């Protein structure tokens, strides 16, 4: 009618110009994707992001691993050959938490925890859970039990793996912003999805980086994380995206090196012939095994992401314990080399 | 016993593929081998739609056969006049990693969703006056990969969480769950009397389902890859699938088997979307190589070529009046052929 | 449809041999790259070895490097894995694995719970 084409140009008019709006946020804003291998740490380097600037699910879990130990106990005693403790002390412990039953608002008393690790190593108990499947049991109930040091330490803050061990996430994708010098980042965590990436991970195509956080203090998790990383670096779709990798958990590594106990020796052989790169920057005092082992394990990964794509994507490895509050400065330094890099590559000039 | 269990499978797997090649009399090849070719396919861009900002990963046409509904990671539903190129509406998403997105055919209602595990619905024809999302259906445990309005109040999705639901959208509440893929399920199509859909998955097959019932009725294999799209024949007796494995199948659904295979050698990328003409003569694919093949369904011969996009060709989709195709695609625009 | 069937396994001594087969069938063998992956009882899927579509590119796990030996017949589509010096900690369902994609260096889901490019195993018992 001219006015029904009019009034088209004029709605057109102004969606163009929220779109214009909405591209300088989108411009202005680097996009990260947080990839944590199983047990990492980035939930923690998560919890301290936002507290500088999912973890509230850790009751839960603690309340999951509760009714585990008192439906092993009840039920155990009440079989129809009822199991003995190997300890009359780790029964009355028992007697204890059966009290302990049906109380809400629950302290979770360290004593608890000490109470719930003696009796699951009691074999008694333990004889129970072999016929625990007859009774009805809590499917969580082994995994929790084996964790409950961990649980324990008060600053636990429940893993990914411990999240699907239980049901406790609905959301897909977990977002989490924050700034750094007035630059506005925004990460995602993925959330509730299955294990099998292949499909979701090409949504990630263009963001600034992904940030892949390793525990390196595993030994075979870190042959797992090593094939996980070497996929993301040789995928089509993700050929261009760069890699801030944070090799997590040195704390706990300098630790396991140093007592001997476990050799990364026997999970990497070839370490036996590993020397420290001439090049390395230890820590002003740590000892020479531990920045053997810290290096070896970067190498590992650098070996990877040297292998390919020189100019075209690029690998940020850092030495971290997920509870450094230089992180987030990190991210920053690595995206703006990022971009930097970008943008010469551009013009030519690299 | 897991042992025998395990192969009485394979004795009613032996079961079904004889039955399959006693019924495998004469190939379509040799059905249609005397028939003319469609000569050469010779499309053009009629339209360009630019406006997202980020990589496009679906788009629907409205029943219209004039507006359509594109979702761009940007984080935007945009509600496109393809005619006049302009904007009829723009739709901030509450999660910016939409996979999906449909149009009622009503033209009342768009949804979408994605990462977010959530089937959103938006209201397009409020009383206030205003596009604002109506409805949230949170149950799946993965990622939206794609969702089909039956009618203004039922909706069916197929989730990475290996399954299909069928909603109701004014409960908000989930009616039936299709189970039995045992992959990320990628692609949904409705059959034409929208009694039946098919769903392609990660494990290579093809599944037809029952709404009103909820079971699966038969099983389609065939595919060495993940299957990424589906899409019926026109008649509803058919139906095309597209691979990680650089191929297209056709599937009858009465002769429970493999028809044709659309394949060829300088193609080695997988195909991310299919759609037949209004006839069903061509079928159009998206490849990941930035162009769409136009094959010949009955004569597996190639008919022509689609180019013109910069990056990976998301998603296509032909009109209900048969007169248009649109293509979206990683380049963030979307292209009106004809 | 993509079948994978492992062949061979057994129960063995510490120090002694063992081949394993896979017998492939419903995919192009040579435009695959191929794995081993392995279960240990109690255990997840944890990676073994990988071999590129020809057969020149090979890796294995640190803790069998030096004793498993992969390899992979395209013409017959069949792959190997013949184990040497087996200790306890070998014992496991080893399986058959392919990479998702054809023609591809990136093979993701490998090790998945779920997996559907993976057969049904083969149990090894040192």
């Known amino acids: 009618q001219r006015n029904e084409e009019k009034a088209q140009r004029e709605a057109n008019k102004k969606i163009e110009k929220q779109l214009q709006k909405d591209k300088q946020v989108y411009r202005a804003t680097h996009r990260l994707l947080l990839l944590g291998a199983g047990e990492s740490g980035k939930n923690t380097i998560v919890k301290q992001m936002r507290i500088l600037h999912k973890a509230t699910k850790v009751q839960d879990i603690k309340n999951n691993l509760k009714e585990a130990i008192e439906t092993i106990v009840a039920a155990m005693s009440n079989l129809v050959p009822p199991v003995e403790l190997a300890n009359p002390e780790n029964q009355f412990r028992v007697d204890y938490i059966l009290s302990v039953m049906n109380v809400p608002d629950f302290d979770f008393p360290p004593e608890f925890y000490e109470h719930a690790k003696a009796l699951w190593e009691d074999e008694g108990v333990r004889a129970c859970y072999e016929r625990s499947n007859e009774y009805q049991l809590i499917d969580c109930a082994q995994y929790f039990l084996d964790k409950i040091d961990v649980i324990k330490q008060a600053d636990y803050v429940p893993s990914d793996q411990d999240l699907l061990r239980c049901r406790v996430l609905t959301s897909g994708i977990f977002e989490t912003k924050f700034q750094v010098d007035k630059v506005n980042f925004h990460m995602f965590d993925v959330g509730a999805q299955r294990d099998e990436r292949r499909k979701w991970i090409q949504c990630f195509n263009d963001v600034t980086a992904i940030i892949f956080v390793v525990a390196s203090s595993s030994y075979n998790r870190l042959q797992a994380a090593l094939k996980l990383f070497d996929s993301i670096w040789n995928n089509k779709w993700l050929r261009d995206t760069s890699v801030i990798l944070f090799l997590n958990k040195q704390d706990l590594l300098a630790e396991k090196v140093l007592a001997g106990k476990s050799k990364i020796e026997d999970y990497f052989p070839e370490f036996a012939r590993y020397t420290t790169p001439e090049d390395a920057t230890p820590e002003p005092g740590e000892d020479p095994r531990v920045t053997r082992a810290k290096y070896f394990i970067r190498d590992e990964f650098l070996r990877i992401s040297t292998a390919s794509g020189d100019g075209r994507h690029y690998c940020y490895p850092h030495f971290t314990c997920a509870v450094d509050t230089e992180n987030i400065r990190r991210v920053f330094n690595d995206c703006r080399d990022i971009i930097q890099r970008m943008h010469l590559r551009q013009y030519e000039l690299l | 016993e897991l042992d025998q269990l395990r192969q009485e499978a394979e004795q009613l797997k032996n079961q079904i593929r004889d039955a399959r090649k006693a019924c495998a009399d004469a190939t379509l090849s040799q059905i249609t081998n005397n028939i003319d070719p469609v000569g050469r396919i010779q499309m053009r861009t009629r339209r360009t739609l630019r406006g997202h900002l980020a990589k496009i990963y679906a788009m629907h046409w409205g029943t219209d056969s004039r507006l359509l509904v594109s979702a761009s990671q940007d984080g935007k539903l945009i509600i496109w006049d393809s005619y006049t190129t302009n904007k009829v509406h723009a739709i901030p998403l509450r999660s910016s990693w939409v996979m999906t997105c449909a149009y009622a055919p009503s033209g009342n209602y768009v949804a979408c969703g994605g990462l977010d595990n959530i089937c959103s619905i938006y209201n397009l024809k409020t009383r206030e006056g205003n596009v604002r999302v109506s409805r949230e259906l949170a149950g799946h445990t993965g990622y939206l990969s794609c969702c089909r309005f039956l009618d203004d109040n039922q909706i069916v999705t197929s989730s990475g969480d290996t399954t299909c639901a069928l909603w109701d959208i004014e409960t908000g509440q989930q009616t039936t769950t299709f189970t039995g893929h045992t992959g990320d399920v990628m692609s949904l199509s409705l059959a034409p009397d929208t009694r039946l859909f098919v769903s392609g998955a990660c494990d290579a097959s093809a599944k037809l389902w029952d709404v009103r019932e909820g079971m699966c009725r038969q099983t389609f294999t065939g595919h060495e890859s993940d299957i990424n799209a589906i899409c019926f024949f026109p008649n509803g007796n058919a139906f095309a699938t597209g691979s990680d494995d650089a191929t297209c199948r056709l599937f009858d659904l009465r002769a429970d088997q493999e028809l044709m295979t659309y394949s060829h050698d300088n193609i080695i990328c997988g195909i991310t979307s299919v759609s037949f003409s209004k006839s069903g003569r061509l079928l159009l694919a998206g490849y990941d190589d930035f162009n769409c093949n136009v094959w010949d369904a009955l004569k597996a011969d190639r008919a022509g070529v689609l180019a013109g996009h910069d990056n990976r060709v998301s998603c296509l989709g032909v009109t209900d009046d048969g007169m248009a195709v649109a293509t979206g695609s990683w380049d963030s625009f979307l292209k009106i052929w004809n | 449809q993509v079948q994978l069937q492992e062949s061979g396994g057994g129960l063995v001594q510490p120090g002694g041999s063992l081949r394993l087969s896979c017998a492939a069938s419903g995919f192009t063998f040579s435009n695959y790259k191929m794995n081993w992956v392995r279960q240990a009882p109690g255990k997840g899927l944890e990676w073994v070895s990988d071999?590129?579509?020809?057969?020149?590119?090979?890796s294995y796990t640190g803790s069998v490097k030096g004793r498993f030996t992969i390899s992979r017949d395209n013409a017959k589509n069949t792959l190997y894995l013949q184990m040497n010096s087996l200790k306890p900690e070998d014992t496991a369902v080893y399986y058959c694995?392919?990479?998702?994609?054809?023609?591809?260096?990136?093979?993701?889901?490998?090790?998945?719970?779920?997996?559907?490019?993976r057969g049904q195993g083969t149990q090894v018992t040192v």
């Open positions: 694995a392919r990479c998702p994609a054809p023609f591809t260096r990136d093979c993701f889901d490998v090790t998945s719970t779920t997996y559907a490019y």
């Open positions: 071999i590129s579509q020809s057969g020149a590119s090979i």
